[PDB]
Design a protein around this ligand. Structure first.
Ligand SMILES: NC(=O)C1=CN([C@@H]2O[C@H](COP(=O)(O)OP(=O)(O)OC[C@H]3O[C@@H](n4cnc5c(N)ncnc54)[C@H](OP(=O)(O)O)[C@@H]3O)[C@@H](O)[C@H]2O)C=CC1
Ligand SMILES: COc1cc(Cc2c[nH+]c(N)nc2N)cc(OC)c1OC
Length: 162
């Protein structure tokens, strides 16, 4: 169970469906970070995504309906079931992809946190949930500059201590 999202300096994520900042280098970070892993996206994000499902990537949708028809992409309606699959897959763990609703239900059960902090500052109404950074420790961090002052950003990966 890991969290994988992107936020600006204030900690924004996405406003009204489409993200607030257009960062091409971030999308690659999202795909590369979920290659061969289970991608949990709530019915709101999966419905807002641009190209679904991802190529050679495990994607799971979360919804409260019972007739959700999605051939090619996994489908579940209870975090309890999703937690089972990852425990049963020896090569596909549980990775969260959002949106905010999915970061809250899994906030208690977290194992790895992946956040992208951009240098630019955007505004909106939906932001990432309150994570306990004090209980986790960043094990890997990479900063990359870009021709655009705001499109600049860093990748932070954390792990839960025991
Ligand atoms: N920074 C980032 O990484 C990401 C950011 N974003 C931004 O966030 C927005 C989405 O945030 P938010 O408004 O919170 O919505 P979400 O996209 O997080 O909504 C998740 C949906 O999943 C379903 N769901 C949630 N919990 C459960 C559960 N326990 N059982 C069953 N179904 C469940 C609900 O759908 P239902 O209506 O079917 O019950 C819920 O509306 C995106 O539009 C985008 O702007 C989106 C993805 C990633
Ligand atoms: C991989 O493509 C998208 C991915 C996301 C979610 C997302 C983005 N970036 C990061 N770092 N984590 C995420 N979960 C949101 C999108 O739009 C809101 C996308 O389409 C541009």
């Amino acid at each position: 169970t890991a969290f994988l999202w992107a936020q600006d300096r204030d900690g924004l994520i996405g406003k009204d469906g489409h993200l607030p900042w257009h960062l091409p280098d971030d999308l690659h970070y999202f795909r590369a970070q979920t290659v061969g892993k289970i991608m949990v996206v709530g019915r709101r994000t999966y419905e807002s995504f641009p190209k679904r499902p991802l190529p050679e990537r495990t994607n799971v949708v979360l919804t409260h309906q019972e007739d959700y028809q999605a051939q090619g992409a996994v489908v579940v309606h209870d975090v309890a079931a999703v937690f089972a699959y990852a425990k049963q897959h020896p090569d596909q763990e549980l990775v969260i992809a959002g949106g905010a609703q999915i970061f809250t239900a899994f906030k208690d059960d977290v194992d790895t946190l992946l956040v992208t902090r951009l240098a630019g500052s955007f505004e909106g109404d939906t932001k990432m949930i309150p994570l306990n950074w004090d209980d986790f420790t960043k094990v890997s961090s990479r900063t990359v500059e870009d021709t655009n002052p705001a499109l600049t950003h860093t990748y932070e990966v954390w792990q839960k201590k025991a």
